[PDB]
């Protein structure tokens, strides 16, 4: 019954910057609040217990404050091993409830995507299906828009896209949009093009092939 709201939903910051995130409780929880760090695919790690006390092994750059309803978590000199989704958790009254999360992103210099396009394999065409694949490689930020056009007729409702997690070395993203057709639909057209609109991209790049 203790709803937990964190602000903001998601933020981006650089290495060495100080950032604060807030955590609001629906009712009074005095100091019965814990802060957790959660990288994707791995276990959550306890960072701050009793809303102000640092957990063993947690570096000194993490700090927490607050009592009652309003709580803050502060990281002072940001490091690349601190970027995760952060949760606050009440422990005053059952049921135990968490915040929705706060994705922490690494700001870096803006990087243009390397655009590659992949025709469907001949092994797939003998199976009667065709998947054309567009690859966007090593870009920042995460927002990029991909549009498929065949013979200058843009497609709609037949393409699915996925984006990787943020890389740990260069803090970049990679995106793969996959247009799926039948074999008769694939061998009916010639031009298969992939248009990319990215923030680090002056004119929209169109990569294409003719098979």
């Amino acid at each position: 019954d203790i709803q937990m709201t964190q602000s903001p939903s998601s933020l981006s910051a650089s290495v060495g910057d100080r950032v604060t995130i807030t955590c609001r409780a629906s009712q009074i929880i005095s100091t019965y609040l814990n802060w957790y760090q959660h990288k994707p695919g791995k276990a959550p790690k306890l960072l701050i217990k009793s809303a102000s006390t640092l957990q063993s092994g947690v570096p000194s750059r993490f700090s927490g404050s607050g009592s009652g309803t309003d709580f803050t978590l502060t990281i002072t000199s940001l490091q690349p091993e601190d970027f995760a989704t952060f949760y606050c958790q009440q422990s005053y009254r059952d049921p135990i409830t968490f915040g929705q999360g706060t994705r922490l992103e690494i700001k870096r210099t803006v990087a243009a995507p390397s655009v590659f396009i992949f025709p469907p394999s001949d092994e797939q065409l003998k199976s009667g299906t065709a998947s054309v694949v567009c690859l966007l490689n090593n870009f920042y930020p995460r927002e990029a828009k991909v549009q498929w056009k065949v013979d200058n007729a843009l497609q709609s409702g037949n393409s699915q896209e996925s984006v990787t997690e943020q890389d740990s070395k260069d803090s970049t993203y990679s995106l793969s949009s996959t247009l799926t057709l039948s074999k008769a639909d694939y061998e009916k057209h010639k031009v298969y093009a992939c248009e990319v609109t990215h923030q680090g991209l002056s004119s929209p790049v169109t990569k294409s092939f003719n098979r």
Binding site: P95, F98, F118
Partner: protein, 224 residues
């Protein structure tokens, strides 16, 4: 020291039950309460209940009391959880966690150690093995001498599949994408790796795809 190792990922049909386990190592298993939690996709964590491994007594959340059962096996130091009546809402990653304050002098509930997570997928689709297709390199050279090649793992169920390149001897510049659920009900992902275009044809590249629920391992060489 302390580490909690959970069961592997499972996939159940709607209406059935799942028994997720979690094995404790590095501390006296009795005397620390074992809490079970879950995370719906893109929704944050939900708490489900805690189990006392010394008594077997439990307290489940009121939302889960008809459906969930948390049992112990004290000698192998393993906590179990059995959630019945599985719906499509119950597709989540499930976490076990140790309550430190039931073994120390604090009054909170602090989860200092967590398990690695267990993906439980509830869908009506049956298990189907993946079809692996090459993503052949072509006149694809940005950055100068920089080619891209890949492997498309299409139409499998359930997650996960593990992909590696040249038996794991190629980890640099590889991007394996998260699987996307389709309208058919089947998953598909792609794994790409960027290599210099000078090495095309001199070095042979093989992606190793393994799907443990379907007992499928296929190795296909990607060639220009």
């Amino acid at each position: 020291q302390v580490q909690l190792v959970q069961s592997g990922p499972e996939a159940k049909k709607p209406g059935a039950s799942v028994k997720v386990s979690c094995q404790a190592s590095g501390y006296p298993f009795s005397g620390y309460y074992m809490h079970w939690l879950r995370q719906a996709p893109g929704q944050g964590l939900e708490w489900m209940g805690w189990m006392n491994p010394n008594s077997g007594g439990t307290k489940y959340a009121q939302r889960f009391q008809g459906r969930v059962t948390m049992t112990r096996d004290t000698s192998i130091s393993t906590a179990h959880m059995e959630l019945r009546g599985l719906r499509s809402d119950d597709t989540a990653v499930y976490y076990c966690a140790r309550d430190y304050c039931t073994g120390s002098s604090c009054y909170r509930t602090d989860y200092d150690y967590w398990g690695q997570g267990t993906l439980v997928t509830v869908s009506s689709a049956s298990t189907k093995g993946p079809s692996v297709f090459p993503l052949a390199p072509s006149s694809k050279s940005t950055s100068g001498g920089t080619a891209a090649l890949g492997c498309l793992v299409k139409d499998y169920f359930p997650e996960p599949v593990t992909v590696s390149w040249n038996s794991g001897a190629l980890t640099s510049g590889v991007h394996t994408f998260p699987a996307v659920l389709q309208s058919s009900g089947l998953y598909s992902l792609s794994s790409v790796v960027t290599v210099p275009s000078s090495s095309l044809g001199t070095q042979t590249y093989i992606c190793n795809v393994n799907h443990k629920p379907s007992n499928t391992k296929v190795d296909k060489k990607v060639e220009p």
